[PDB]
Design an enzyme around this catalytic site. Structure first.
Site, PDB file in Angstrom:
ATOM      1  N   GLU A   4      40.403  35.636  45.127  1.00 12.27           N
ATOM      2  CA  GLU A   4      40.333  36.018  43.612  1.00 12.27           C
ATOM      3  C   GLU A   4      39.114  36.833  43.407  1.00 12.27           C
ATOM      4  O   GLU A   4      38.116  36.749  42.477  1.00 12.27           O
ATOM      5  CB  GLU A   4      40.072  34.773  42.868  1.00 12.27           C
ATOM      6  CG  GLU A   4      41.378  33.806  42.620  1.00 12.27           C
ATOM      7  CD  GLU A   4      42.433  34.871  42.141  1.00 12.27           C
ATOM      8  OE1 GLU A   4      42.338  35.341  41.238  1.00 12.27           O
ATOM      9  OE2 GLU A   4      43.809  34.499  42.708  1.00 12.27           O
ATOM     10  N   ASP A   5      38.786  37.774  44.205  1.00 14.00           N
ATOM     11  CA  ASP A   5      37.795  39.062  44.334  1.00 14.00           C
ATOM     12  C   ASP A   5      36.572  38.522  44.713  1.00 14.00           C
ATOM     13  O   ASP A   5      35.565  39.350  44.581  1.00 14.00           O
ATOM     14  CB  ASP A   5      37.937  39.580  42.806  1.00 14.00           C
ATOM     15  CG  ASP A   5      37.976  41.302  42.904  1.00 14.00           C
ATOM     16  OD1 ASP A   5      38.173  41.866  41.696  1.00 14.00           O
ATOM     17  OD2 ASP A   5      37.859  41.816  43.880  1.00 14.00           O
ATOM     18  N   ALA A   6      36.190  37.222  44.586  1.00 13.52           N
ATOM     19  CA  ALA A   6      34.772  36.864  45.015  1.00 13.52           C
ATOM     20  C   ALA A   6      34.358  37.349  46.382  1.00 13.52           C
ATOM     21  O   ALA A   6      35.181  38.177  47.135  1.00 13.52           O
ATOM     22  CB  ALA A   6      34.581  35.411  44.876  1.00 13.52           C
ATOM     23  N   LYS A  27      34.556  45.016  42.062  1.00 10.01           N
ATOM     24  CA  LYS A  27      33.456  43.709  41.327  1.00 10.01           C
ATOM     25  C   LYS A  27      33.823  42.584  41.966  1.00 10.01           C
ATOM     26  O   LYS A  27      34.813  42.167  42.106  1.00 10.01           O
ATOM     27  CB  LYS A  27      33.165  43.813  39.852  1.00 10.01           C
ATOM     28  CG  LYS A  27      34.423  43.183  39.173  1.00 10.01           C
ATOM     29  CD  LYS A  27      34.263  42.708  37.810  1.00 10.01           C
ATOM     30  CE  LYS A  27      33.826  43.889  36.936  1.00 10.01           C
ATOM     31  NZ  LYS A  27      34.896  44.725  36.730  1.00 10.01           N
ATOM     32  N   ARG A  56      45.162  47.301  44.359  1.00  8.79           N
ATOM     33  CA  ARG A  56      43.892  47.908  43.900  1.00  8.79           C
ATOM     34  C   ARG A  56      43.591  49.459  44.552  1.00  8.79           C
ATOM     35  O   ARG A  56      43.206  50.153  43.571  1.00  8.79           O
ATOM     36  CB  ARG A  56      42.475  47.082  44.312  1.00  8.79           C
ATOM     37  CG  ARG A  56      42.356  46.078  43.436  1.00  8.79           C
ATOM     38  CD  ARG A  56      40.876  45.755  43.643  1.00  8.79           C
ATOM     39  NE  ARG A  56      40.758  44.469  42.965  1.00  8.79           N
ATOM     40  CZ  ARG A  56      40.139  44.242  41.905  1.00  8.79           C
ATOM     41  NH1 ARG A  56      39.680  45.238  40.964  1.00  8.79           N
ATOM     42  NH2 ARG A  56      39.842  42.877  41.410  1.00  8.79           N
TER      43      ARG A  56
END
Ligand SMILES: [Zn+2]
Ligand SMILES: [Zn+2]
Lengths: 48, 48, 440, 145, 45, 49, 49, 95, 49, 89, 68, 317
Positions: C182-184, C322, C355
């Protein structure tokens, strides 16, 4: 409401699908009442 | 060019000036644009 | 155009026959078109940009009324004769200043470049060089910044070298720790405790006694301690003698910061530090109220809070990628190549599909290529064509340096010791630390 | 920073990117009893709109699933036992005494457990006291071709 | 008496409590306090 | 779905990409790199002549 | 009409503003206020509607 | 409390889970490697509850012949002998 | 293109007294400050009054 | 919906001649992200993306005030709480 | 600010390799590979003293206690 | 319950298979080749080298006066990261203070260094040269200005080997006329898994000795391109009277496993790039504390100590 914390979450794969990790800070800052009986008396004495 | 010239009615080997005049007549309107873009979009999506 | 090229160089500069800024808006006639008639504008407060006139070879300025009627061929090679009467200098001239500084900005799905612009406008970066003389409320400064190893030439032209934004992270695209979904992302622990993106916030708060002087009396309150007793338990610990705090004494939440007393009551009042994070004190200013002949009726105290990378502080490359520093893996449990560098930050591979930040793959290639030889890899939008790809250029670079040509690198895992079956992708990305975590 | 597992990320519609969550505590014992039995998380496996379940693993776990259950995989004894025990981790959960395994898929010239046997092994250790094994047939996502 | 710094001239002012605040040699009207000798410790972390 | 759209007589004047996301999306378009703003007019009587 | 015009960076470091100052902002109470650019219709050109 | 036995241990002390305190994979993996070299063990796999704390759940199950504590003792002795062999060869190499 | 390092250090250490090393930041802020310059000179307020 | 908006003079972008037919002017862009998209293509891509971004709670107090109770009573007839039937079974 | 002693990824100390790297570019006509004379074999300790903004020699020109 | 009957532990057979060679040993770097050791043991050695052995490093920093631009805690931190040359086994650990904390220092525990520097204006300067090394004195507070102050008996214990900062050339801060730094730092023993500054080795890692072997012999221009592929030295171009040119791998130990040859379409037929499974190549580069030989021996001794600790506490229950 009383007794309701609020914080940022972050992911962890080690714990469980149920469980939620709380730092010991929320351990110390959220409490709930409990009557004291014969067989949980040791837990509560040790807690106090 | 194939799709546009087929839409407006002319052939691929038409004079540039007549195709230009017909195109100028086409997208002053709005419905004729719908038709032109639909046709050309069908062509391009076939290619894609 | 001709008289402008006369006027710029040696030949005399009389009042120009026709100025450059004048725009000759010819509106050709056509049925059901714009009403046709030549339009000569000479007013100020218009938009006007430069292109190169192709019949001549010099500048020419044009505004948003001849745009729609001129064939401005966008490359030397696009020009088709007899029609294209203008050439763009260099299509980089179409983007803005902050948007143009995104290396390989023409590889990403344009929503990613939109997010990257709107998010690089919010980095914890160096807000200048004169910070000792700034009376702003909240400044953020980055202790360890560097110039990017992948950069557009305009990052040198626009003088960004004086204001760095982030550091160069040795990023390994890998799904190994497990915390980075989850993008972390992770942050190699020792790569953090040796001084990775290390923020310092400056909160300067002002105290003004002229407000608590409602009406009726003259100036009464003053800074200092009333002639008499002063509590030792806190007030003499921080505040020097003048009611103004020590320079360099660490404060906590419930701590007094300034001291003033009334004249009538003669009792010393106090003001406490409202913020909830231990900050220091770096500079206090005794603002002379005015022209002169006044007592110090204003003070300005600049607390220097410190903000290392704490779990939850957004990091984000120059592509809209990010994340959040998820756990800070120990430097021993991280992978390593044959060389031995622990990747400073583990990013997750599942974040690149859906993405389209293929620009980031190219940038990692270019970083690991430029850092080796010592180049400043040029990354202006729209240089690399379809004939020879940018990836192949940086691959030639790397295979000259010695590493794998696709950018891969053979890594051994740390928690088991025996090599990962599949090679892993390590590069040198430019990670600018964000500051959205100020209100946690 | 409180920690929760990935499975709930699909349910709360969260991204772990900075959105924060209220965390209450039911004081009385009736409230915590009903929270534990009626509204506890493991019982929220089915959304109410349609039957299609909403919990379940995500990106990394499922790619590594395609790579583990694949048939060109092979483990020696050490990796099999170790990976199994990492999966189970009984003591933190409890209720079980000793971990039980399968025979190896191949036995000579070197003993090798295969990946599908690890999935079967996990299923074998979590079978209740007396419920016959699971049996099932269902199309997978990675197409056959 | 306290010791300050005139912002511009950088001159020790020696101004006392409840006094007219200004640089004794320049006339500037901004005064920083100077960092005295005092013991603080920080862990090297 | 009005002006908050990027209709293209901006090529080189105001940036295509750089514009905040969300509710003010499409309103505040930061100028291009090189787009100047002519603000000092000049005499033009030679234009009628 | 400020006392920084034409000053070179060294004389700006002699003052207390940083070497490559930009200007453009009226200092009002100490918070650097600025007048944003707005967009208007064309000067003097009779447009249709 | 360096090493303790968790509440999941079989009464015959054959299927037992030591929990080594203040250790991570450094010793866990090495000891598991050496213990596997023991014929009379059926299962040996270490874990970590949560990297925040330094505790290592061990786990050793054996055949009824020899209990598990003897297996752990013999395995630690063997690992010590391995470390000594490595250090002897290393020291003898250089003058 | 290489990192201007020697030039960076020789513009940091001894700052330039000739003219701002970076003309493009100033050509970026030029709209506002040249508009105010047009306010004072070039007879703008005088025409207003 | 359709495709790139044509300005007044009929050219899709100031790079293309008027009434240009070749699909590269119709917003069809052939280059791929791996190799890199050209300027005329990149502009249309910004158009589509920012269109998306300008594209990307009262109906939970309508269907909820009236359906407050609506509970499944024990004779297995879902009634409103005032007592009136709404559905059997 | 000053050069980041102890580069992040590696553990090598490179605090002292800045006034001895700069005076290789300055007068030796050697290019960005000057640092190969410094002994930086990797590229994690090498992108530290290579792309380093030494932004403290610009910030020290604001001594408020200048006496001038 | 399957054991393979060949995975058996036999210390005689093991020590018979294990072979060690030390390729190059220096005052800072060392590279040496271990053989016959499973991934777990060599990974344990690396893991301990990086973190688990102790080394003196600055923990506390008492500032008395610091008016430089370098922030206060930034200066404390940047001091912390500097190394200290002291035999880390002549000390005892610091019993960290619980409440009742202040009086918790001794001379077997810590070491004390101090610096004090006030950059005065240098007046012998001819003209304007913002070097500023010649314009000002004591411009840069180097690390060499951390002068040691012994605490009692220490002065005699370390007389043969004075305790100094190992890199006396590091720049710790920069000062200009008027401003001053003054602080003393107390260093205690640490274990690398706490903070990075305790880790003795700059970089310690190993590589599985790669193996490159030709299946079918290449010729001519293929041989030239092949030899050009890998870094120099590893690929020999065969001198063959029969035929013209072949390629045989001289020494695989130089090769980096870049896998560059596998990129060309016709070469992927000829060669495989594998790794000898039990052959590890350790590389250890320490920082300033101990010579790498002592690093490795102390690492394996720490492993043995951990094993004996667990065994001793097991004998209790
Ligand atoms: Zn003055
Ligand atoms: Zn490094």
């Amino acid at each position: 409401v009383n007794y309701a914390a609020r914080s940022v979450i972050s992911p962890d794969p080690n714990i469980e699908t149920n469980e939620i990790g709380v730092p010991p800070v929320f351990a110390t800052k959220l409490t709930y009442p409990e009557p004291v009986t014969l067989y949980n008396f040791n837990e509560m004495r040790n807690a106090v | 060019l194939e799709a546009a010239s087929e839409y407006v009615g002319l052939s691929t080997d038409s004079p540039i000036a007549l195709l230009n005049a017909n195109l100028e007549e086409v997208y002053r309107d709005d419905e004729k644009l719908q038709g032109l873009d639909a046709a050309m979009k069908g062509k391009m999506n076939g290619l894609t | 155009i001709e008289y402008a090229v006369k006027l710029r160089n040696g030949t005399a500069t009389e009042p120009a026959k026709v100025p450059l800024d004048l725009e000759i808006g010819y509106v050709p006639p056509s049925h059901n078109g714009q009403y046709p008639g030549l339009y000569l504008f000479s007013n100020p407060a218009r938009m006007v940009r430069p292109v190169k006139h192709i019949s001549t070879g010099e500048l020419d300025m044009l505004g948003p009324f001849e745009q729609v009627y001129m064939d401005i061929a966008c490359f030397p090679k696009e020009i088709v004769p007899k029609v294209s009467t203008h050439v763009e200098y260099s299509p980089t001239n179409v983007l803005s200043i902050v948007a143009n500084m995104t290396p390989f900005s023409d590889f990403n799905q344009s929503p990613r470049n939109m997010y990257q612009c709107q998010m690089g406008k919010q980095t914890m970066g160096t807000p200048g060089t004169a910070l000792r003389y700034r009376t702003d409320n909240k400044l953020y400064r980055l202790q360890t910044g560097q110039t990017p190893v992948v950069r557009p030439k305009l990052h040198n032209t626009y003088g960004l070298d004086h204001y760095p934004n982030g550091t160069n992270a040795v990023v390994a695209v890998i799904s190994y720790t497990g915390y980075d979904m989850e993008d972390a992302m992770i942050l190699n622990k020792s790569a953090h405790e040796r001084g990775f993106g290390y923020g310092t916030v400056y909160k300067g708060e002002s105290f003004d006694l002229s407000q608590k002087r409602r009406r009726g009396e003259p100036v009464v309150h003053h800074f200092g301690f009333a002639p008499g007793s002063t509590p030792r338990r806190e007030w003499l610990q921080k505040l020097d003698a003048d009611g103004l705090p020590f320079i360099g004494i660490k404060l906590e939440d419930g701590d007094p910061i300034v001291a003033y007393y009334d004249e009538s009551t003669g009792q010393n009042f106090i003001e406490t530090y409202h913020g909830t994070e231990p900050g220091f004190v770096d500079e206090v200013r005794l603002l002379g109220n005015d022209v002169g002949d006044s007592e110090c009726q204003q003070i300005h105290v600049k607390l220097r809070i410190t903000r290392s990378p704490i779990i939850g502080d957004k990091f984000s490359s120059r592509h809209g990628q990010k994340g959040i520093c998820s756990q800070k893996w120990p430097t021993v449990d991280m992978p390593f190549t044959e060389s031995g560098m622990q990747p400073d930050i583990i990013i997750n591979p599942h974040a690149f599909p859906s993405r389209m930040t293929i620009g980031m793959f190219i940038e990692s290639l270019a970083g690991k290529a430029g850092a080796c030889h010592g180049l400043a890899q040029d990354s202006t939008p729209f240089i690399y064509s379809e004939q020879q790809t940018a990836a192949d250029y940086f691959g030639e670079q790397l295979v000259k340096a010695g590493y794998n040509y696709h950018g891969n690198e053979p890594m051994y895992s740390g928690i088991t010791g025996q090599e990962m079956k599949a090679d892993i992708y390590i590069g040198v990305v430019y990670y600018q630390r964000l500051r959205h975590m100020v209100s946690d | 920073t409180i920690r929760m597992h990935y499975a709930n990320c699909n349910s709360y519609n969260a991204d772990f990117d900075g959105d924060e969550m209220n965390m209450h505590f039911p004081q009385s014992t009736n409230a915590r009893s009903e929270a534990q039995f009626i509204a506890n998380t493991d019982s929220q496996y089915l959304v109410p709109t349609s039957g299609d379940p909403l919990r379940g693993l995500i990106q990394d776990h499922v790619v590594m699933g395609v790579w583990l259950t694949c048939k060109d995989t092979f483990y020696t004894r050490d990796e099999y036992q170790q990976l199994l025990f990492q999966a189970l981790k009984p003591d933190e959960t409890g209720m079980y005494g000793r971990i039980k395994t399968l025979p190896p898929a191949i036995q000579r010239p070197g003993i090798y457990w295969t990946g599908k046997q690890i999935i079967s092994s996990v299923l074998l250790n979590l079978k209740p006291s007396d419920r016959p094994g699971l049996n099932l047939k269902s199309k997978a996502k990675v197409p056959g071709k | 008496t306290m010791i300050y710094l005139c912002a511009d001239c950088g001159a020790r002012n020696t101004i006392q409590a409840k006094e007219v605040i200004r640089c004794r040699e320049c006339g500037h009207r901004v005064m920083y306090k100077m960092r005295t000798k005092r013991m603080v410790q920080f862990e090297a972390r | 779905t009005t002006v908050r759209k990027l209709l293209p007589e901006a090529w080189g004047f105001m940036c295509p990409v750089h514009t905040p996301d969300g509710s003010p999306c499409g309103l505040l378009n930061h100028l291009a790199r090189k787009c100047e703003i002519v603000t000092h007019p000049s005499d033009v009587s030679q234009i009628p002549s | 009409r400020c006392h920084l015009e034409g000053l070179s960076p060294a004389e700006l470091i002699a003052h207390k503003e940083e070497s490559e100052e930009m200007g453009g902002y009226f200092i009002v109470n100490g918070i650097e206020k600025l007048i944003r650019m707005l967009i208007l219709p064309k000067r003097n050109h009779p447009t249709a509607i | 409390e360096k090493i303790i036995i968790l509440p999941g241990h079989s009464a015959d002390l054959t299927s037992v889970t030591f929990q080594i305190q203040k250790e991570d994979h450094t010793l866990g993996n090495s000891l598991r490697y050496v213990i596997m070299k023991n014929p009379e063990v059926e299962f040996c796999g270490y874990s970590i509850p949560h990297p925040s704390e330094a505790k290592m759940n061990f786990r050793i199950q054996t055949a009824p012949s020899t209990t598990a504590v003897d297996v752990l003792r013999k395995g630690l002795d063997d690992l010590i002998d391995l470390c000594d062999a490595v250090t002897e060869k290393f020291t003898e190499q250089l003058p | 293109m290489s990192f201007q390092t020697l030039e960076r250090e020789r513009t940091f250490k001894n700052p330039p007294k000739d003219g701002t090393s970076f003309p493009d930041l100033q050509k970026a802020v030029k709209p506002h400050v040249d508009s105010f310059n047009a306010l004072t000179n070039a007879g703008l307020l005088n025409y207003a009054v | 919906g359709r495709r790139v908006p044509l300005m007044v003079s009929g050219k899709s972008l100031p790079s293309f001649v008027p009434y240009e037919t070749s699909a590269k002017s119709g917003g069809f862009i052939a280059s791929r992200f791996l190799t890199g998209i050209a300027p005329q293509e990149y502009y249309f891509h910004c158009m589509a993306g920012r269109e998306g971004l300008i594209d990307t709670g009262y109906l939970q107090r309508c269907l909820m005030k009236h359906l407050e109770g609506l509970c499944v009573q024990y004779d297995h007839t879902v009634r409103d709480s005032d007592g009136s039937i709404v559905q059997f079974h | 600010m000053i050069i980041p002693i102890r580069c992040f990824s590696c553990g090598k100390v490179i605090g002292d390799k800045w006034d001895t790297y700069l005076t290789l570019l300055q007068e030796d006509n050697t290019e960005g590979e000057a640092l190969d004379k410094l002994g930086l074999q990797r590229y994690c300790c090498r992108r530290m003293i290579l792309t380093h903004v030494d932004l403290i020699e610009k910030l020290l020109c604001y001594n408020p206690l200048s006496k001038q | 319950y399957y054991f393979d009957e060949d995975n058996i532990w036999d210390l005689d057979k093991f020590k018979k298979n294990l072979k060690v060679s030390i390729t190059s040993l220096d005052q800072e770097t060392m590279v040496f080749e271990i053989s016959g050791i499973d991934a777990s043991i060599a990974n344990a050695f690396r893991r301990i080298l990086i973190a688990e052995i102790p080394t003196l490093a600055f923990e506390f920093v008492y500032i008395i006066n610091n008016t430089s631009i370098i922030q206060d805690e930034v200066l404390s931190h940047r001091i912390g990261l500097v190394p200290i040359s002291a035999d880390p086994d002549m000390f005892k650990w610091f019993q960290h203070p619980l409440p009742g904390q202040e009086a918790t220092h001794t001379d077997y525990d810590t070491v004390v260094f101090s610096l004090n520097k006030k950059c005065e204006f240098n007046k012998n300067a001819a003209t304007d040269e913002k070097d500023p090394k010649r314009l000002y004195v004591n411009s840069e507070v180097y690390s060499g200005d951390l002068i040691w102050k012994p605490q009692g008996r220490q002065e005699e214990r370390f007389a043969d080997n004075p305790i100094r900062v190992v890199n006396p050339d590091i720049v710790v801060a920069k000062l200009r006329p008027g401003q001053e730094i003054d602080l003393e730092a107390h260093a205690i023993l640490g274990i690398g898994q706490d903070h990075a500054k305790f880790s003795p080795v700059a970089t310690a890692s190993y590589r599985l000795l790669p193996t490159i072997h030709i299946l079918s012999p290449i010729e001519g221009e293929d041989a030239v391109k092949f030899q050009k592929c890998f870094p120099k030295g590893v690929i020999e171009l065969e001198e063959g009277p029969d035929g013209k040119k072949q390629a045989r791998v001289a020494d695989v130990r130089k090769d980096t496993v870049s896998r560059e040859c596998l990129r060309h379409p016709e070469f992927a037929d000829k060669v495989q790039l594998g790794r000898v499974r039990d052959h590890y190549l350790f590389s250890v580069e320490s920082t300033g504390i101990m010579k790498p030989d002592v690093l490795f021996i102390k690492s394996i001794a720490v492993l043995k100590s951990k094993c004996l600790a667990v065994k001793s506490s097991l004998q209790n229950i």
